[PDB]
Amino acid sequence: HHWGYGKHNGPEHWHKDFPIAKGERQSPVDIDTHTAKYDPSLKPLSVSYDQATSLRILNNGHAFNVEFDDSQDKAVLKGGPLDGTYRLIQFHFHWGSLDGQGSEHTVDKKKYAAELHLVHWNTKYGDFGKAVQQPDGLAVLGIFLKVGSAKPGLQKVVDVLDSIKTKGKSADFTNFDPRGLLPESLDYWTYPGSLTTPPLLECVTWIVLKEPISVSSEQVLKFRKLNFNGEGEPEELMVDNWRPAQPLKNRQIKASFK
Ligand SMILES: NS(=O)(=O)c1cc([N+](=O)[O-])ccc1Cl
Ligand SMILES: [Cl-]
Ligand SMILES: [Hg+2]
Numbered sequence: 706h707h708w709g710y711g712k713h714n715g716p717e718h719w720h721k722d723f724p725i726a727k728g729e730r731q732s733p734v735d736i737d738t739h740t741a742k743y744d745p746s747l748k749p750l751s752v753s754y755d756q757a758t759s760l761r762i763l764n765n766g767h768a769f770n771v772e773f774d775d776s777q778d779k780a781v782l783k784g785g786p787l788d789g790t791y792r793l794i795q796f797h798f799h800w801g802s803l804d805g806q807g808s809e810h811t812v813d814k815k816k817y818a819a820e821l822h823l824v825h826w827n828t829k830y831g832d833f834g835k836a837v838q839q840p841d842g843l844a845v846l847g848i849f850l851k852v853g854s855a856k857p858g859l860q861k862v863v864d865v866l867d868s869i870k871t872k873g874k875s876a877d878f879t880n881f882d883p884r885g886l887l888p889e890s891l892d893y894w895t896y897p898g899s900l901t902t903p904p905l906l907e908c909v910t911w912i913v914l915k916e917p918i919s920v921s922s923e924q925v926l927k928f929r930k931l932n933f934n935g936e937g938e939p940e941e942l943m944v945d946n947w948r949p950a951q952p953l954k955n956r957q958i959k960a961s962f963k
């Protein structure tokens with residue numbers, strides 16, 4: 706009985722094996738744009754993905770990960786609310802069964818069709834493993850996806866999904882440039898949070914971009930062809946793999962823009 710997104714193992718059940726699910730800084734959260742406050746103390750956000758080196762793509766049972774070689778100082782996120790440098794290790798998405806839902810964070814209660822998460826670990830901690838034992842160990846750059854015009858830079862990911870349909874399958878995925886998945890503006894909202902998936906560790910500084918990227922209906926439709934199940938098992942489409950908004954509690958969301 707592994708955690709998942711179904712009726713008997715979904716978000717409302719996670720707290721049993723992962724008590725921190727009811728913690729003080731859980732993610733995602735609803736971003737109330739009117740309550741968010743512009744923060745002058747925030748420094749310019751820096752996303753440097755020019756040397757990013759992808760290795761492979763994997764269906765892990767709850768989503769698919771595009772993994773990067775993080776053994777060297779490449780693909781780094783710094784500035785903004787961050788102290789020091791954070792290194793990109795992987796990115797993945799959360800999406801719905803319909804265009805009207807799919808994102809984890811919401812904006813004034815609005816749900817987007819999907820949400821992209823670029824995961825980075827604080828280099829001061831040596832590696833990802835040690836980083837997730839720290840309150841400021843991770844930084845996730847979140848980007849909303851809406852259905853409209855296709856995103857050319859996403860097609861290479863879409864076309865390889867047919868090879869990793871079921872849980873456990875992986876495939877080489879080199880030379881993929883994540884810069885092609887970024888919107889024009891880096892305006893963002895930021896707050897202290899957690900992993901949105903078990904173990905739900907509270908080590909994340911969330912940086913959610915205001916401007917969504919547009920992807921085509923065809924592209925998201927292919928995301929929905931993936932399977933939660935492993936090969937040879939009854940088909941359970943990989944859809945609605947998103948956790949709903951959690952209590953903001955003692956937290957303030959800061960905006961990088963006026
Ligand atoms: N959703 S997330 O970005 O908080 C996240 C997801 C996973 N995952 O479910 O593979 C690992 C790390 C992080 Cl920070
Ligand atoms: Cl597991
Ligand atoms: Hg999983």
Ligand SMILES: [Zn+2]
Nearest residue numbers: 798799822901
């Ligand atoms: Zn995620």
